[PDB]
Amino acid sequence: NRDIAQVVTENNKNYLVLYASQTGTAEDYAKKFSKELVAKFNLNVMCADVENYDFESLNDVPVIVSIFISTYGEGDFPDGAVNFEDFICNAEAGALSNLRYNMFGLGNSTYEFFNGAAKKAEKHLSAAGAIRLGKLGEADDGAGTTDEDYMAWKDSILEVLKDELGVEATGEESSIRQYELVVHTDIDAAKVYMGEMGRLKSYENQKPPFDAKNPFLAAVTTNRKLNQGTERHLMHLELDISDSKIRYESGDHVAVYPANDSALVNQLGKILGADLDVVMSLNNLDEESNKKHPFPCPTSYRTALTYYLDITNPPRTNVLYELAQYASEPSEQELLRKMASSSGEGKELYLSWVVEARRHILAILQDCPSLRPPIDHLCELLPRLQARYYSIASSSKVHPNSVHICAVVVEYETKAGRINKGVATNWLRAKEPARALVPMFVRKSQFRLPFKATTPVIMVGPGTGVAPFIGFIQERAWLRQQGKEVGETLLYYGCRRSDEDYLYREELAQFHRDGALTQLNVAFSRHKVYVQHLLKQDREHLWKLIEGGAHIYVCGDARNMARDVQNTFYDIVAELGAMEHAQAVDYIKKLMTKGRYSLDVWS
């Protein structure tokens, strides 16, 4: 009841404000401070009149204590606060070593002992081992300064507390703009970036060598549905690289710089209120830094959103944080800051609402209608639009001037009822051969057919992971057509169904007919027949091939399939080689080192 440490603990207080007051001024300001403590840190504050407690347990109060105290005699406390005074003056060395406090005394210089109470108190607190945080305040009612004396003191202690308690004050946007807006409302189109990636006008000029910094614009020669079913769209594209001088081999990847859907970009401009044809630059406030801009400038908002900015993936923590100020509806602003937080609770609301719902920026704007930022701050915060990679599905020996892509279109419904569209694949799908140009480049990999033709090859490529092997098979067929003896060429393919999603049914059957493909092993899942079982089934034969210097290749979207396939090979070497599992793994390791076990797995 009168035990101050007891009462503080019982009631789960984060912070204690005490006051001693004859005529209500200290009480008033102790209350004003408490109110500000809560408004800014959302603490659970007790604010109590010293007169109502015994203080023998002052040292056991486990929160920070503010003390407001008035002077009334010979530097005495108010007569009602006798018990509080008798404790502070009797306090022996070390008695209050756990007490962390701040203090604001109330006095009047027109009396003999200006602020004697708070001055005495502080001598005794520190003498007994307590640590004061911040300055000792001393209101002067004699000068008429008390309110401003408090104002100054309060601002001070709140800065001290911001570090002591961690955290930031509600009502604060420590928001740092990295770049600055300049509107180029007059400038000629030749100086303005139009969606090209490196040097200005490079999509026009097109001079070798083409690469990541300078992609070749390849015409789309073919674009056909590969699959029988309607659930999914899987497609085969052909990219004309005639006159590029780009060299590739089977096993290489082709990278592609897509465009965002223009309808999406429009919808975005319409909800931001922004006119997107405004050409502009975002110049770095760090004048001496390397990145002068977040993306090629001068450029229009339409262009940045279309070609240089990622607007489809879930925005990150820091972009929610920075957008939160632009939410006029307070409860919408609370959401965003919470989702931007380091809180277990906030992180978790973020994962499900932002990440798991796959909410892109437009979706966040639409569902938080009071969030209305300026386009230029948004463009600064959004991540860069990345290139997208595909396993070339052609051999350069039959298609030297053509690069083939095999891809499933990403198109799916979210928890929140939206339909999301994968950028590159829907873009590629909309490319009609009747010119339609795809910015691209080739990155070399170490995924290669054996250069010694007689060497057997074992390809494991379920689903879209057949991609690289289509080119491997074209190539091997080609080697046979040229008079070379070619070793066995085994494909272990997989899909759901033969009349739904059998990729390259004609071509693989025909390559098999012509003897180019020695074996087409398909594992249609739809009872759960995956490729692992086909490998185990054919284990006896696979071990001969392996022992005969065969090369193994694993391709596909799923890391687990690769892992299951590797495990299956571990068991085959274990059984048929007659060795310990540990030796089996080390054998397959040796293969990898020799370059006879290669992977192309995309996660």
Ligand SMILES: Cc1cc2nc3c(=O)[nH]c(=O)nc-3n(C[C@H](O)[C@H](O)[C@H](O)COP(=O)(O)OP(=O)(O)OC[C@H]3O[C@@H](n4cnc5c(N)ncnc54)[C@H](O)[C@@H]3O)c2cc1C
């Ligand atoms: C080296 C390499 C080679 C590759 N080769 C090929 C290839 O030959 N063929 C191929 O098909 N892929 C391949 N991949 C993937 C390919 O690069 C693209 O990521 C893919 O085509 C999707 O791109 P997008 O722009 O259409 O989708 P994006 O706009 O990038 O969206 C893809 C994202 O959407 C999300 N997503 C997808 N489906 C769902 C779902 N149903 N529910 C919720 N979220 C979902 C995922 O988070 C995924 O990261 C390869 C990857 C790498 C790294």
Ligand SMILES: Cc1cc2nc3c(=O)[nH]c(=O)nc-3n(C[C@H](O)[C@H](O)[C@H](O)COP(=O)(O)O)c2cc1C
């Ligand atoms: C009778 C009386 C004695 C006072 N003695 C002092 C004093 O010794 N030193 C001082 O600085 N102020 C003195 N004051 C000023 C008070 O401390 C000042 O008015 C203060 O704001 C009172 O706060 P409170 O309303 O919480 O009691 C005195 C005021 C009165 C009314």
